[PDB]
Amino acid sequence: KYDVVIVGSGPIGCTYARELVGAGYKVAMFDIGEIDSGLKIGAHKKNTVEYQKNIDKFVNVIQGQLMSVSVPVNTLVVDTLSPTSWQASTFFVRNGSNPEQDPLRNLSGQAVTRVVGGMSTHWSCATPRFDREQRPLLVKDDADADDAEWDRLYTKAESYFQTGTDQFKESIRHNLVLNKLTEEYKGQRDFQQIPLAATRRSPTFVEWSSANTVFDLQNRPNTDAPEERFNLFPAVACERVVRNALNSEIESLHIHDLISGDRFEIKADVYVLTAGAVHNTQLLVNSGFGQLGRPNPANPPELLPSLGSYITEQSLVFCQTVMSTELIDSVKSDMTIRGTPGELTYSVTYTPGASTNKHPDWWNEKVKNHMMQHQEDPLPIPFEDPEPQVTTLFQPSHPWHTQIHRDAFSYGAVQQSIDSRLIVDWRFFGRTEPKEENKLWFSDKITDAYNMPQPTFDFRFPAGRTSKEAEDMMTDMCVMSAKIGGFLPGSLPQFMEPGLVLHLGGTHRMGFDEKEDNCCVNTDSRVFGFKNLFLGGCGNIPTAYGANPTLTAMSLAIKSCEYIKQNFTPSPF
Amino acid sequence: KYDVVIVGSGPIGCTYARELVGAGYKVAMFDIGEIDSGLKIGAHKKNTVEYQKNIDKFVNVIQGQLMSVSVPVNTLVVDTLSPTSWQASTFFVRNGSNPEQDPLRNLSGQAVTRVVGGMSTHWSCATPRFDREQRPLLVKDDADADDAEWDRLYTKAESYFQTGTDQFKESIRHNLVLNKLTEEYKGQRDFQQIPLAATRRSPTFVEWSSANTVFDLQNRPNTDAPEERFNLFPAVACERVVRNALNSEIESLHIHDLISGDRFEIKADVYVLTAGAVHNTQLLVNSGFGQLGRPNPANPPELLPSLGSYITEQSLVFCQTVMSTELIDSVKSDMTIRGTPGELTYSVTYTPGASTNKHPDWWNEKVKNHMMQHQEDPLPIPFEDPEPQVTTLFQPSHPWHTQIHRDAFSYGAVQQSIDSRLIVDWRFFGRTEPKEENKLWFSDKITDAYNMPQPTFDFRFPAGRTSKEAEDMMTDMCVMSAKIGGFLPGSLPQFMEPGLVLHLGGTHRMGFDEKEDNCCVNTDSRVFGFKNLFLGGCGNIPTAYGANPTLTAMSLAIKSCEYIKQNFTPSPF
Amino acid sequence: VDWRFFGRTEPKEENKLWFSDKITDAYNMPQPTFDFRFPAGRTSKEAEDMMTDMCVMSAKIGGFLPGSLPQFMEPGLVLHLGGTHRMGFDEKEDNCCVNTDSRV
Amino acid sequence: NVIQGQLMSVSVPVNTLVVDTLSPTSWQASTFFVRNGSNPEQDPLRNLSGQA
Numbered sequence A, B: 001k002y003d004v005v006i007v008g009s010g011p012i013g014c015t016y017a018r019e020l021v022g023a024g025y026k027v028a029m030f031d032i033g034e035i036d037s038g039l040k041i042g043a044h045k046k047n048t049v050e051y052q053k054n055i056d057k058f059v060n061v062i063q064g065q066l067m068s069v070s071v072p073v074n075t076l077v078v079d080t081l082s083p084t085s086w087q088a089s090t091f092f093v094r095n096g097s098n099p100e101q102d103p104l105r106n107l108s109g110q111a112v113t114r115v116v117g118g119m120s121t122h123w124s125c126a127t128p129r130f131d132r133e134q135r136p137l138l139v140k141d142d143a144d145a146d147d148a149e150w151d152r153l154y155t156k157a158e159s160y161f162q163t164g165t166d167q168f169k170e171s172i173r174h175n176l177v178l179n180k181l182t183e184e185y186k187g188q189r190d191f192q193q194i195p196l197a198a199t200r201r202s203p204t205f206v207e208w209s210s211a212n213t214v215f216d217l218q219n220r221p222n223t224d225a226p227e228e229r230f231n232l233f234p235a236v237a238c239e240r241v242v243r244n245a246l247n248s249e250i251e252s253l254h255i256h257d258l259i260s261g262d263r264f265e266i267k268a269d270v271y272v273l274t275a276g277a278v279h280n281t282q283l284l285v286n287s288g289f290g291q292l293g294r295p296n297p298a299n300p301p302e303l304l305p306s307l308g309s310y311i312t313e314q315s316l317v318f319c320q321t322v323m324s325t326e327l328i329d330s331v332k333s334d335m336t337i338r339g340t341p342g343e344l345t346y347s348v349t350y351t352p353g354a355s356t357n358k359h360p361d362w363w364n365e366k367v368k369n370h371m372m373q374h375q376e377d378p379l380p381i382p383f384e385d386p387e388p389q390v391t392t393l394f395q396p397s398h399p400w401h402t403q404i405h406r407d408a409f410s411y412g413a414v415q416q417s418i419d420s421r422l423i424v425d426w427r428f429f430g431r432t433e434p435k436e437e438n439k440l441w442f443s444d445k446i447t448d449a450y451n452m453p454q455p456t457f458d459f460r461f462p463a464g465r466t467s468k469e470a471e472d473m474m475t476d477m478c479v480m481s482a483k484i485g486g487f488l489p490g491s492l493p494q495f496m497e498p499g500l501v502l503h504l505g506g507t508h509r510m511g512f513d514e515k516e517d518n519c520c521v522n523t524d525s526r527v528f529g530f531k532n533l534f535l536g537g538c539g540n541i542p543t544a545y546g547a548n549p550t551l552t553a554m555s556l557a558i559k560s561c562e563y564i565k566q567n568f569t570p571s572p573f
Numbered sequence C: 001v002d003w004r005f006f007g008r009t010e011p012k013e014e015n016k017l018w019f020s021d022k023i024t025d026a027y028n029m030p031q032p033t034f035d036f037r038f039p040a041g042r043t044s045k046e047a048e049d050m051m052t053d054m055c056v057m058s059a060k061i062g063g064f065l066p067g068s069l070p071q072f073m074e075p076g077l078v079l080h081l082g083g084t085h086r087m088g089f090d091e092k093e094d095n096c097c098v099n100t101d102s103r104v
Numbered sequence D: 001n002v003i004q005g006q007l008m009s010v011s012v013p014v015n016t017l018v019v020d021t022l023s024p025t026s027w028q029a030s031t032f033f034v035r036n037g038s039n040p041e042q043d044p045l046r047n048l049s050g051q052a
């Protein structure tokens, strides 16, 4: 018996933990995955000395924990087997593929992560706010009020994640890019640092935020928390919440301890599902909400008819550039140079404080030192100079999010031929109109690796605005990236596979009114009809958004937690 | 002040910990890497429910922690940059390459792993014994005595690692392969299960051994060890051991706490280096043993002249096969089949205990169940059937180690087209003659990511036996693999990049006599001349070996630990 | 649909085709050798504005075909090499080889 | 294929690609010497590699 139970230990789950363990509830949290992030439970895997000295290698950590959601049956022809080897007569169901999935209407790139801390153990930590156009209303007919509430919620969310916008302010590459872009779009667009959940510790080490940052996930009571009550149970698959006959309350959470193989049931007053956009929906449909199986409109669901419909995922375009000759020369524009590199008479000098210096003394000092200490190196940028982290946020005239940066998650065998200091990544993210015909559904025959109903997508980017904007987005990336340099061969401008972007939303969408707004949960994230069932995550977001959704989902959880504290009484300790 | 200090937390380091913490020494161990394996410190990363349900993904975990030792300057031509982008006039030193390294005499595949538990957090857990031909002598002129000692040492080593040979005995694929090979080579070669440091927990879960298995790496005293004394310090780079003027004893270990940036010195009575074959040699050469810089025979080292010479690494050949039609039909040879799959009259039956049954009832039952429960599936092998794990050990008439199996570390984007149940991996490993001209050396100008002398290889597989055997090895793999099925397209027979195999040996080699045997340490693994300095690891092994070296290195550490216990007195507690 | 945009290149003295006095080609003639880079200045700016134009204009007709993404081709693949024996009125003033009748 | 069959490259620089998975028994280069009709005079970084 707990006061509250949480399914999932991602940062949205941890938002609920932090709020509710702190309010004095007896909390239990289960995760289907295991603790594997070192002694700080649920922390960012990027935060080791070894990874920030070899950041190129972290792509492999991310790849190692992205398990594809739905993989269609494979139809590749292999006709150079030896005559003696067993050979197929058909393309039969092999290697865990999903025979329900149409390869041409899939989110082939969608994947899930089963570890403690969830995807926040590997994420890129960008946490922009949504402007009105991207955000669901929290207050009808009172825009300035709706604005205040979101400002209040986001401000707390930024606290929990330790969101900041100046962690890269000392980077020559970052400023080089930022300044050129501002200059080029003078009074048509604004550029700034990407808001990032991150704390710099030194010039060569950044403590990337994660679930741990939100809530440290240590069992309580403990010494630094002697009146709080929290237990985390890793390696527990949660399978069904049990409805009462009235469909007014949840009575139990049914679980599978993966290590012993035993199943149990768990009672709480308050049930919170934060298993992610896909696995929330799976858990619910496994529990009698929505509809199991291939959509059949001639049998409507009894509960939550909009569950798994109106799903959104963002179009992503990508390239990388090599920094222009012009920009590179500009780095060292303040330097007077005498002699020829490599002789003892060679000299690179600047005049501090000189009025006609285009850069600050700190920048000049770095450049001078690098050029004198490394006279074999043909570039003015210091070896350890931190990466760019630039954005122009979504606007109506440019309704896409942009990151102009360096991401651990590169999409191909990485280059060694071109100097890393010249390379900038470009990622533009489009907003997707939510549509009823775009669905995530669960097979009533096929099951996944945990013996749950197999997830299946039926998705295409909507015709209309979504398609036009995506193409205008691609074109924008081409136009804007040219200002900084030419495309890097092998990273030419391209749309990424659908869902690789991992910003799936709308799978258990929020709204004021279940029928009128075609939704699943209300603005307290409570499941309509149910007193004690709450959903947290990107699944909640009902709007077409381009920016990274996590901070938004977090803000919604905070408001959800206000409701719980005002409506349920913690047990005595 | 400690009684003993150990550098490195790999399983060889942990062998020293286990022996010495258990003998009652005050032990400290430092690792340059960090704890990141979940709550069991130093354990196998493969031991999560999620990885053994998605084993294909573990390749990414291994890749994420293999940092290449020496990467030559890159000379690839990129001539499709945009005219505007900064373009090189030369192939200058970019992206951490090593300008000292000749690309044509490198071990390009050699890599290191900096995490707590070392490479044992990701290794494949094969732990064969070496036969006399592969093993260094521990006793001169008394072969039967030398045999007994090694039998004694290996038997303990197998205990520590939990080595077993029956963990896969229930696998249809494993037995299918094993039995065919035995049959084919009848009375010319013997096949058995690869000895593996592993404990099966269930039919779908194997607890893979690691450093943790050897020693749990928890700080002591603690409740289950209240009179023992051990501390582990992660994120500490050890840089130099300090010699006394006499070169008879080590006086301190010099360290760098990576998290605070501060340097300290550490006193112990006994210093143990187990940082791996490369990083032991680096630590030593950084400390005035051997020779820093490009080999210069006209300036001999003062100490340990053979340090970094005579290095061995094994030739590795690889392919994968698709199981023959014949073998696949044999699986179901005992089945009577009526009707046609997919109708309710279809029937697969066998007669238990029937004299003419070629397989045991358990095998038949599995096959019958699979064929009746999955009538859409064209193969008689059950979905969860464990992988093959077969070997014929090195002999004189076949002087190579062989693994006929399924390895998490596949060498290419993996297939989805061919059913996984049909696929077997083939890895044959050759022995390399140790030669003086084959060297690992450290630059006196270039430094690595931890500001230590940059490692550089000068290696070629020796002409003579080594080259002939390697080619006869390749041919053997072709001949033997054909017995089981044809090559899988995309995994055709090939030599792997030198050192990818990660069995590097001989870098601080063991022998009776420093000059006569051209070696660094004696049979107690003590550095010649030095009372209190010991080396552990594959670096010690002075012979040409084909089998996987870790259990051998462990046995040597055990004997090293006998010496220490008989020669140094633990402090009072 | 294929999209090919072709830029103009400023002629420069330092951009040269020359022939080895030691190395010979398959017909035992002096081996051809290039010393070429696209000129800084207008040539480089125009080439990049050209790439951008192709992106902007091609979008009007449809999205890029995967495997044929926008890219600069290897120098000279285009096979429009010019200026190697260039024409002009006056040999010294116009730095040239042949006159307007193409006579040397 | 007809076009490719009649375009002979004008100047091909000496090749520097590393092949380190030869069998130990096979003849192996110690240098990137002039092979297969390459032109040692040509700087790979200032070429018209596509000219034919």
Ligand SMILES: *Cc1cc2c(cc1C)nc1c(=O)[nH]c(=O)nc-1n2C[C@H](O)[C@H](O)[C@H](O)COP(=O)(O)OP(=O)(O)OC[C@H]1O[C@@H](n2cnc3c(N)ncnc32)[C@H](O)[C@@H]1O
Residues within 6 Å of the ligand: A007, A008, A009, A010, A011, A012, A013, A014, A030, A031, A032, A033, A062, A113, A114, A115, A116, A117, A118, A119, A120, A122, A123, A124, A125, A126, A127, A236, A237, A238, A239, A274, A275, A276, A277, A279, A280, A283, A409, A502, A536, A537, A538, A548, A549, A550, A551, A553
């Ligand atoms: C992978 C990734 C994600 C990512 C990113 C780049 C990459 C490479 N960049 C980010 C960006 O810069 N910022 C942005 O806002 N998001 C970014 N993302 C996405 C981010 O990681 C996710 O949006 C965020 O993690 C969502 O958080 P939430 O807490 O909602 O979900 P979760 O992290 O997926 O964790 C859910 C967990 O629950 C578990 N689970 C799943 N099913 C069950 C069941 N049945 N029972 C018990 N537990 C369950 C998981 O194992 C998991 O930990």
Ligand SMILES: *Cc1cc2c(cc1C)nc1c(=O)[nH]c(=O)nc-1n2C[C@H](O)[C@H](O)[C@H](O)COP(=O)(O)OP(=O)(O)OC[C@H]1O[C@@H](n2cnc3c(N)ncnc32)[C@H](O)[C@@H]1O
Residues within 6 Å of the ligand: B007, B008, B009, B010, B011, B012, B013, B014, B030, B031, B032, B033, B062, B113, B114, B115, B116, B117, B118, B119, B120, B122, B123, B124, B125, B126, B127, B236, B237, B238, B239, B274, B275, B276, B277, B279, B280, B283, B409, B502, B536, B537, B538, B548, B549, B550, B551, B553
């Ligand atoms: C990666 C791998 C290795 C492997 C294998 C397959 C793969 C993919 N398969 C194995 C096989 O089946 N069996 C076989 O016997 N070996 C197999 N291997 C090899 C195995 O992992 C290694 O042989 C074994 O781990 C060697 O153990 P040892 O304890 O000698 O070395 P280590 O694991 O590399 O750990 C050394 C550590 O010390 C650290 N370090 C390095 N430098 C320093 C300094 N300067 N200061 C402090 N610490 C240092 C490391 O971080 C490390 O943990």
